[PDB]
Amino acid sequence: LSGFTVKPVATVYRRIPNLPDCDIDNWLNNVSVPSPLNWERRIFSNCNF
Amino acid sequence: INSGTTCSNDLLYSNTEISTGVCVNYDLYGITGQGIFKEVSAAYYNNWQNLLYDSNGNIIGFKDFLTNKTYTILPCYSGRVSAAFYQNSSSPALLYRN
Amino acid sequence: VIGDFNCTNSFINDYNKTIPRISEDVVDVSLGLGTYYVLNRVYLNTTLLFTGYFPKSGANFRDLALKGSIYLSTLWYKPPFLSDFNNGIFSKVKNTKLYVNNTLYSEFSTIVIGSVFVNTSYTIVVQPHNGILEITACQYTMCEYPHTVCKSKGSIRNESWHIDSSEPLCLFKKNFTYNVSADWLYFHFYQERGVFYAYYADVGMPTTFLFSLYLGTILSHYVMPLTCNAISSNTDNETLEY
Ligand SMILES: *[C@@H]1O[C@H](CO)[C@@H](O)[C@H](O)[C@H]1NC(C)=O
Ligand SMILES: *[C@@H]1O[C@H](CO)[C@@H](O)[C@H](O)[C@H]1NC(C)=O
Ligand SMILES: *[C@@H]1O[C@H](CO)[C@@H](O)[C@H](O)[C@H]1NC(C)=O
């Protein structure tokens, strides 16, 4: 008779990232807090967060 | 928005859990397939090596980069039953081989 | 002529006495030199027939040295020095060991791979940093006369080959380490179906896998001079072999 099979679910996904981490928490938790008059700006580009 | 390369890794990292015993699908480093997984102790994997192949070209083992654990992939069951039926019987006799 | 931006115009001339040399050794793939491992596959006790991009057994090598001190020549940025990247290249680099105050420094030439070398397109740049390579596939703005200054003993030039006020869009950026006390290095660079593959090796062995980039375009060209006022065959005998 016809061969009986099953339908698998809950697949797995693996892939190596090509870009490093943005590391935003490291700069947000800095020991130096600038005054409201300074309001230092930091730009991030080409990273994964 | 919807451009550049600065993306997020939240959707593709929902579960990141590997089962051992059940039949499931897998997309590992671009290789797509389906089968069952089993735990084994392997020490022949190098720093840049993540998959294991054979002479025929199929995948037989791999190693997870998030936990440093090796796994072996085995094909899942796909068989066929034999039905022995008489002339005017009500239900045939079933035989599952092996 | 590679780029479209004027970096500097200090000393530019036309030195017409630079001819590449040809080595005397041949390719020997009997022991394993010249071949490379698969991307991320492992084989145990398997005699495998692999169809790929490999160098021909019994061929000859050619050097692409562009050693300069003060004056930069326009012919160095013109063919045959700027060859065509048709299918792939296998390069062998000599590791120069400089000794300053009883320590070792390693500096060798670099190579930039591109198609039109315009900021509107992508380009792959590798660069050694005291034993650390940095592979970046970005939209760098190349100059007409790129160069590199040796940060080991001292020079008189200013290394400037990319001009960007902000960080451009990059598709890949990664740093790698190797053995600083190595003697020779091997590299493979090829492409197929719009996918670029690169392989590196620091010791004598089959080459290992670095990365695989999906670009979608076709690369047709691929070495900037190394401005250094330290290495010279009068006091410190060191030569650049690529
Ligand atoms: C796996 O091994 C690598 C290299 O030995 C290490 O950097 C990484 O932290 C390890 N990961 C885990 C989860 O142990
Ligand atoms: C690679 O090293 C250079 C300096 O050698 C550094 O500026 C750069 O951020 C590094 N890249 C990564 C991804 O660590
Ligand atoms: C570098 O090479 C030297 C000589 O081959 C060797 O003694 C040393 O252990 C190597 N170091 C590394 C990190 O591979």
Distance between the termini of chain A: 53 Å
Shape of chain A: rod-shaped
Helix amount of chain A, in percent? 10-25%
Listing every helix as H and every strand as E from the N terminus to the C terminus, the arrangement of chain A reads EH
Total helices of chain A: the number is 1
Give the oligomeric state of the chains in this entry, treating copies of one chain as homo and distinct chains as hetero: part of a larger assembly
Which small compounds were modeled alongside the protein? 2-acetamido-2-deoxy-beta-D-glucopyranose
Return the structural class of chain A. Answer: little secondary structure
Q: Biggest interface, which chains? A: A-B, 24 and 30 residues
PDB class: viral protein
Keywords: HKU1A, spike, tmprss2, viral protein
Entry title: Structure of HCoV-HKU1C spike in the functionally anchored-1up conformation with 1TMPRSS2
Chains A, B, C: Spike glycoprotein
Provide an overview of this structure.
The structure is cut from a larger assembly and holds three copies of chain A. Chain A has 49 residues and is largely without helices or strands. Helices cover 10% and strands 6% of the residues of chain A. Chain A contains one helix and one strand. The longest helix of chain A is centred in the middle third of the chain and has 5 residues, at 24-28. The radius of gyration of chain A is 23 Å and the shape is rod-shaped. Chains in contact: A-B, A-C, B-C. At the A-B interface, strand 1 of A face strand 1 of B. Strand 1 of chain A pairs parallel with strand 1 of chain B. Bound molecules: 2-acetamido-2-deoxy-beta-D-glucopyranose (3 copies). One 2-acetamido-2-deoxy-beta-D-glucopyranose is lined by residues 179, 181 of chain C. It is classed as viral protein. Keywords: HKU1A, spike, tmprss2. Structure of HCoV-HKU1C spike in the functionally anchored-1up conformation with 1TMPRSS2. Chains A, B, C are Spike glycoprotein.
